[PDB]
Amino acid sequence: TLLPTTSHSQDINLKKQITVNKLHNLRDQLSFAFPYDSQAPIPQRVWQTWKVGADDKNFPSSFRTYQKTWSGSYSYQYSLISDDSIIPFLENLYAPVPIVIQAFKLMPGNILKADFLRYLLLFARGGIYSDMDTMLLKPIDSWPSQNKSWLNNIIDLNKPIPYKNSKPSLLSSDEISHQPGLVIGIEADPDRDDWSEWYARRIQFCQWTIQAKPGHPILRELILNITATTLASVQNPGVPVSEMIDPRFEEDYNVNYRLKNNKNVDGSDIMNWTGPGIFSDIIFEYMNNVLRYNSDILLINPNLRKFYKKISESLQSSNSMPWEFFSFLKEPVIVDDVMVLPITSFSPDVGQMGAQSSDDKMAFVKHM
Ligand SMILES: *[C@@H]1O[C@H](CO)[C@@H](O[C@@H]2O[C@H](CO)[C@@H](O[C@@H]3O[C@H](CO)[C@@H](O)[C@H](O[C@H]4O[C@H](CO)[C@@H](O)[C@H](O)[C@@H]4O[C@H]4O[C@H](CO)[C@@H](O)[C@H](O)[C@@H]4O)[C@@H]3O)[C@H](O)[C@H]2NC(C)=O)[C@H](O)[C@H]1NC(C)=O
Ligand SMILES: *[C@@H]1O[C@H](CO)[C@@H](O[C@@H]2O[C@H](CO)[C@@H](O[C@@H]3O[C@H](CO)[C@@H](O)[C@H](O[C@H]4O[C@H](CO)[C@@H](O)[C@H](O)[C@@H]4O)[C@@H]3O)[C@H](O)[C@H]2NC(C)=O)[C@H](O)[C@H]1NC(C)=O
């Protein structure tokens, strides 16, 4: 295999399908084995994982209440993958792309794996992944990613926002009636007062709850980046990693620039490896990449606001997605096929950055 980077793909159209007549690059291999279907709906399926099943005697008692909100009947299929099942399930799932599972198995320690697992599960099967310390507040068929009524309200009240490379005859709001392919919630507002490293990025999305269609290119790019970083950062890669990476950008693979074993991996390593900072980097890289190469990218922001002129200028003059587009979000926004939810949606009751209570109509999941 060759292991491309995600941070120097400005020369590649990330939405573009690569076809073959009658392979080697891990980006193309993931696309081939897990194709993206923007026309199909999000699967009505919930994924959770823990060391043990829910009826296990060691299942933590403080989680048993939370897990019932997800596992019910929901007019939605629920799957809890116990630790004994994770490896054979990923082996069955990523059989077409075995280097992905090799890397997962080589990850030192339990937190890197549990972080990485959510992206693997969603990319291969879609649905919702939510951590065990989360509570579902409103049924998922009532979410704005799912409820045809809500999606129609977004379509009927908001016109596409143009950008430098856009062609208006291609931009229509009703494309989103096929549902977003990725649904994420703000964790930290980019305009907040706190600039400690409590959160790892300026624009930060909750990693504890994510919804997606299988094959979404952002999940592809996350898996690429984490796969290549793992192999170049562990003591037993099983492959001659130095011969398989981009020769122009060697410092972008080994995690210490940002070998690791079970004893030397710290919290800021996890942060730079599988955590919410790499998630947000990949997401913004993707947003800016698709505007560069496509004339039909749908941009909907019902909150347009104080940053309007800068937003308009970033889009229409610089062809770039400004961080201000995601500031003071009170209603969902659309970037291509990514729906970004307000802080209240997956982070209610934090009494900060405008988060409302889990009683708000925008509150969908409470993080415990
Ligand atoms: C997709 O979205 C659409 C649009 O939002 C959804 O359709 C609407 O669904 C709402 C549900 O919130 C519905 O409003 C209810 O209609 C009921 C039947 O007509 C009413 O009986 C009900 O009244 C109660 O709730 C109100 C809250 O606004 C209270 O003000 C009112 O006093 C009533 O409260 C009593 O009952 C509740 C429990 O029901 C209790 O907590 C109270 O204490 C009190 O006893 C609502 O008004 C709309 O009618 C729907 N709109 C349309 C056009 O159909 C749709 O359901 C979503 N789809 C999915 C799958 O979720
Ligand atoms: C996997 O994803 C990670 C996360 O995105 C990715 O690491 C990132 O790589 C890029 C590109 O190498 C880094 O981007 C910046 O590039 C400029 C240009 O030289 C630097 O100046 C930046 O750092 C300094 O300057 C900034 C001010 O201008 C400061 O904010 C900064 O702290 C430095 O002083 C920076 O290098 C980006 O920093 C990293 N991100 C992280 C978290 O390290 C990685 O390349 C991907 N790997 C693969 C294999 O795809």
Author numbering: 51 to 72, 77 to 129, 132 to 314, 328 to 373, 401 to 464
Quote the authors verbatim.
The crystal structure of Δ52-ScOch1 was solved, in the apo state, at a resolution of 2.0 Å, R/Rfree: 0.1978/0.2428. Co-crystallization in the presence of GDP-Man nucleotide donor substrate did not yield electron density indicative of ligand binding. The N-terminal and transmembrane helix domains, accounting for the first 51 residues of the primary sequence, were excluded from the construct used. The Och1 crystal data reveals electron density covering the C-terminal GT-core domain of the type II transmembrane protein, with the exception of some flexible loop regions and the C-terminal tail, which could not be resolved due to poor electron density (missing A-chain residues: K72 – Q76, H315 – E327, N374 – T400, F465 – K480). The three-dimensional structure of Och1 confirms the GT-A folding structural elements as predicted by its sequence, adopting the canonical GT-A single Rossmann-like folding pattern. Och1 exhibits the archetypical β-sheet core, flanked by several α-helices, with an additional pair of smaller anti-parallel β-strands housing the glycosyltransferase catalytic DxD motif, at position D187-M188-D189. For positions N203 and N281, the electron density was such that partial glycosylation could be resolved. Structure characterization of Och1 reveals the protein somewhat strays from the typical GT-A folding pattern. In contrast, Och1 possesses its DxD motif flanked the β3 and β3’ strands. Sequence conservation, as seen by colour mapping onto the structure, is largely localized to the Och1 active site (i.e., the nucleotide-sugar donor substrate and acceptor binding pocket).
